[PDB]
Amino acid sequence: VYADSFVIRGDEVRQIAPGQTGKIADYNYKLPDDFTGCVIAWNSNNLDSK
């Protein structure tokens, strides 16, 4: 399996999913239509917010 880790805003969380598109999932990271796996996201205001 694969683990792709990055930091995105809470608004663009819905962009990480097969199908729908957007500025984030057009030139940065796009999922395949028949993607098999899971998408794991969690709040991290206490670690990255300088």
């Binding site: 097969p18 199908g19 729908q20 239509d33």
Partner: protein
């Protein structure tokens, strides 16, 4: 594509059902025509000759 696939699937299902219906009707009509042609061949062999 992700949302057009469903519409294309619906159209494919409809067209496939139409083609299947046409093929079945053609098979039945061709069987009837074959029976009539066998009768015609029997008539030609047993009447003309």
């Amino acid at each position: 594509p992700p949302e057009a696939e469903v519409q294309i699937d619906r159209l494919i299902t409809g067209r496939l059902q139409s083609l299947q219906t046409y093929v079945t009707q053609q098979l039945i009509r061709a069987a009837e025509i074959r029976a009539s042609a066998n009768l015609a061949a029997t008539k030609m062999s047993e009447c003309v000759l």
